[PDB]
Amino acid sequence: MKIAVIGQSLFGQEVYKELKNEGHMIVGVFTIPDKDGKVDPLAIEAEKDGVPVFKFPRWRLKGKAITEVVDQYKAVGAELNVLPFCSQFIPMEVIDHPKHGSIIYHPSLLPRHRGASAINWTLIHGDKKGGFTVFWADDGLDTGPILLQRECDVEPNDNVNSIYKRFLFPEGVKGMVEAVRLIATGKAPRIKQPEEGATAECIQKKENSKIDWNQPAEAIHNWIRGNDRVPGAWAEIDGKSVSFYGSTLLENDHFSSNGQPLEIPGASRAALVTKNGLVLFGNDGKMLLVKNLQFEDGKMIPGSQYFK
Numbered sequence: 001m002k003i004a005v006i007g008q009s010l011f012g013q014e015v016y017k018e019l020k021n022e023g024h025m026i027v028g029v030f031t032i033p034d035k036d037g038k039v040d041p042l043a044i045e046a047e048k049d050g051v052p053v054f055k056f057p058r059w060r061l062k063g064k065a066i067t068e069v070v071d072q073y074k075a076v077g078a079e080l081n082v083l084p085f086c087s088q089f090i091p092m093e094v095i096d097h098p099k100h101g102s103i104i105y106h107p108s109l110l111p112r113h114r115g116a117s118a119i120n121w122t123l124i125h126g127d128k129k130g131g132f133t134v135f136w137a138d139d140g141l142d143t144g145p146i147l148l149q150r151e152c153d154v155e156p157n158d159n160v161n162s163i164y165k166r167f168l169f170p171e172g173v174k175g176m177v178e179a180v181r182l183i184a185t186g187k188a189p190r191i192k193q194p195e196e197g198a199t200a201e202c203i204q205k206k207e208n209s210k211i212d213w214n215q216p217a218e219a220i221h222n223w224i225r226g227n228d229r230v231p232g233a234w235a236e237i238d239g240k241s242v243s244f245y246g247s248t249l250l251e252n253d254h255f256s257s258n259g260q261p262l263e264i265p266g267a268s269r270a271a272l273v274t275k276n277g278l279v280l281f282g283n284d285g286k287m288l289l290v291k292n293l294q295f296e297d298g299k300m301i302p303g304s305q306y307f308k
Contacts, residue, residue, distance in 0.1 A: 001184050004078035004098070005042065006030040012084040013041040014173045015105070019082065020049065022177060028076035030054045032087060052076060056088070065091040073097070080183060082176065083137065087116070095137045100183055102137040103147060105176055107168045110135060110149070111198035114142035119160050119168065121201040123226030126218070130154045130163060132172045134179040136190055141200070145190040147179050157248050159228035206231040211244070213266040217282030221247045224290065232294065237264055245300065246291030250279065254287070260307060278303030 003024050005016045008031045020026055029046040033055045043053045056069050073094055081095065081102035095102045108118035110133040115121070122130045131151040138144035152167040182188035202208065209227040211220065211234065224247040227233040232243035259272030259279060272279035278290040292300045 001025070001100075001180070002027045002077055002079040002098075003180070004028045004030060004073070004076055004081050005046075005084065006081050006088075006090060006094075006102075007084040007086040008032050008040045008042050009085045010041045011105070011169055011172065013045050014169075015082060015084045015176045016042055016045055018173055018177045019180060022180070024180065026051045027078050028052045028054060028073070030056065030073065033057055058088075059091050059094065060089055065093050070094060080180065081137075082180065084176065090137075092139050095139075103134055103176075103179055103183070104137050104142070104144070105172055106133045106135060106142055107131075107164070107172065109133060109151065110142060110146060111193040111195070114198070114200035115202065117201065117204040118142075119164060120204045120226045121199075122154065123158060123160065123163070124222050125226075126222045127154050130168070132168055132175060134175050135193075143193065145192050147182065147188050147190070148175060150175055157225065159225040159245075159247075161229050204231055206234070209233050211235045213264070213268060214283050216284035217280075217286035217288045218249060220280065220282050221249050221288045224288070235264060235266070237262070241296055243294040243298075244278070244280075244290045244292075245294065246277070246303075248289045248291075250287040250289045262306060273304065273306045275304050278306065 001024055003019055003026050005012060005026060016026060029042055029051055031040045031042045046053045054072060059066060059069055070093055074097060078098045080098050080100040083102055083104040106118060108122055109131050113121045129151055131149065133149045134147045136144040136147060150171055154163060179188065204227060209231045211223060224233045224244050228245045234241050234243040257274050259274045262271040262273050264271050268281050268283045276289060278293065280288050280290060290303050293303055293306065294300045
């Protein structure tokens with residue numbers, strides 16, 4: 001069928017590539033403008049194939065759809081919109097235009113974790129199960145009826161990168177391909193999202209990923225891994241913003257060490273720089289271990305190497 005891919009990232013690129021390879025006609029790719037002279041992976045592949053690329057800065061202006069860009073969109077004659085990691089606001093005029101409307105990839109088990117940082121919140125909340133949903137876009141945010149859903153276990157030390165690389169990305173690509181298959185072959189369902197279990201959270205940015213120290217060790221562990229790598233949980237240390245990566249919980253066989261104390265403003269007590277990384281305390285007397293630290297615009301350095 002005729003598909004417009006509206007989105008970005010290597011995930012968007014892979015979904016484009018697999019749909020193409022399944023015999024679908026990609027009539028257009030609609031992605032973000034160039035930033036720092038880097039073209040989005042989705043745009044790179046499309047161009048290589050001669051598929052038309054569009055890079056709208058915005059689809060809307062003062063609460064009204066920009067007719068000139070909507071018209072460019074409508075001209076490619078999509079029969080279905082596919083939205084992998086679309087970071088743009090898409091007018092309902094566009095969402096509803098194709099005969100099959102639009103499907104969206106969402107990296108959580110809807111109705112839980114609506115919002116653009118669902119992977120982060122899956123981990124921040126310490127969920128035991130995670131996964132993704134392919135759903136039909138409606139006018140709300142991640143509220144449309146479910147086409148399909150796939151689950152995975154969340155590992156205790158999973159960060160955003162590990163669960164994304166292990167499951168959400170490669171199975172997510174397959175799920176999108178399968179969803180289009182079901183649509184083409186005419187049997188895709190529209191399961192209304194249940195009310196029970198619905199949650200919605202905010203977008204994670206550097207600013208709001210600052211560590212709140214007045215939590216138990218386990219919650220701090222979840223906070224750090226839930227923002228690792230991006231945007232990077234951080235705290236001020238010695239006047240400067242330090243980001244934390246590679247968290248594990250630490251309970252026992254202590255205090256071997258001997259650690260070198262590191263004051264962290266707001267921490268329940270001083271941290272310990274040790275051979276195995278940076279030991280941090282929660283407000284419950286318990287410990288976590290951070291393997292890697294990063295300063296602003298910085299390369300990562302091992303927690304063990306803080307004073308060197």
